[PDB]
A paper describes a structure:
Here, we used Tethering to successfully identify a covalent allosteric inhibitor at the 197 site of PTP1B. For this reason, we designed and synthesized 2, which has the orientation of the amide bond reversed, allowing for one less carbon in the disulfide linker. 2 exhibited dose-dependent tethering and partial noncompetitive allosteric inhibition of K197C with a tethering EC50 of 7.8 ± 1.1 µM and a Ki for pNPP activity of 7.1 ± 1.1 µM (maximum inhibition of ~60%). To futher validate that 2 acts specifically through the K197 site and to explore the mechanism of inhibition by 2, we solved a high-resolution (1.95 Å) crystal structure of K197C tethered with 2. The structure confirms that 2 tethers to K197C rather than to the active-site catalytic Cys215, and also that tethered 2 resides in the 197 site rather than in the relatively nearby BB site, which is also theoretically within reach of the tethering linker on the other side of the α3 helix. We modeled 2 as partially populated and, indeed, the 83% refined occupancy in the crystal structure was very similar to the ~85% conjugation measured after tethering in solution prior to crystallization. Additionally, 2 packs against the hydrophobic floor, centered on Leu172, of the relatively shallow binding pocket in the 197 site. Beyond these mutation-induced effects, we see some conformational changes associated with tethering of 2. The key residue Asn193 changes rotamers, the sidechain of Phe196 on α3 ‘slides’ to change its aromatic stacking arrangement with Phe280 on α6, and Glu276 -- which contacts the wedge residue Leu192 -- rotates sidechain dihedral angles. Thus, although the mechanistic details remain unclear, allosteric inhibition by 2 may involve conformational changes, especially of α3, that are similar to those that occur during the global transition from the open to the closed state.
One system that would benefit immensely from an improved mechanistic understanding of allostery is the archetypal protein tyrosine phosphatase, PTP1B (also known as PTPN1). PTP1B is highly validated as a therapeutic target for diabetes and cancer and has also been linked to Rett syndrome. Transition of this loop from the open to the closed state is rate-limiting for catalysis. By exploiting a new multitemperature multiconformer X-ray approach, we have identified a collective allosteric network that is contiguous on the ‘back side’ of the protein, centered around the quasi-ordered α7 helix.
Author numbering: 1 to 285
Amino acid sequence: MEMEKEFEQIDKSGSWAAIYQDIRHEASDFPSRVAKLPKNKNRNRYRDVSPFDHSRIKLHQEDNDYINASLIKMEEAQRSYILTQGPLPNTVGHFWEMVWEQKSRGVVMLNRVMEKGSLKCAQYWPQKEEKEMIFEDTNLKLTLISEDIKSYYTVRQLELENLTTQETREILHFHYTTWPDFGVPESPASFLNFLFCVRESGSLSPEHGPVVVHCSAGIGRSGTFCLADTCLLLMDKRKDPSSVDIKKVLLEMRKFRMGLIQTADQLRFSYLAVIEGAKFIMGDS
Ligand SMILES: *SCC(=O)Nc1cc(-c2ccc(F)cc2F)ccc1O
């Protein structure tokens, strides 16, 4: 497999930091003017992580339509994702408004609420069936329906109700709970099993809105999730799978949101996940 030996080549030569930096200098730069408006300073978790204006998701409350969220559109793979930051205490209502307005079926969470002794995002869904959440700014109600805790991740069924119309939708929440505080997982196995769980749920499918994917900044682990998903999808779609160049896919995704894949270590891990996930989809059972 092309990338498999390109992987060994990079590894043996300890070249990850050099490839990753070539990616950073090749990466697109587009304006992020809405994100920088003073009125939006507290809608951003990080000052240096902003959605591009061209791809940003707009809340349909036109009032302030801003949310730190980007639409990543992968045209050949026919996949779309919304990558967003972990919601802030003051943007949880916006997050669920986005989920509602974009008709998303799944939310993918790749971080824990607290990591490294700091809060990486707000507790934005209910932890008990009987204790639902009501977001009064956006007129939404969110109920925990069911929770399936597994060794490496948790899947939850949620009910999102639009209070103004009394329509309800079921949202699936896929929470990868075991990414390490430092570095990347030692093996990609649990991450792929997580990815295939999201796929199996139907959440990534074109009949629904884009899956909403987040970590804390919405670029690192979140970038790794989408990048692997799209590369594997392309390797199945193309006549020759070895024509799939992960670096090119990354650069295409970076046209939609800055900074995807934060460290050379995440890049290496992304390669590893795609190579291993290939074995599970280009054959086998
Ligand atoms: S790990 C793959 C997966 O789909 N897991 C999972 C799915 C669901 C669910 C609920 C409702 C529905 F209409 C479809 C569906 F797949 C619930 C829990 C769970 O772990």
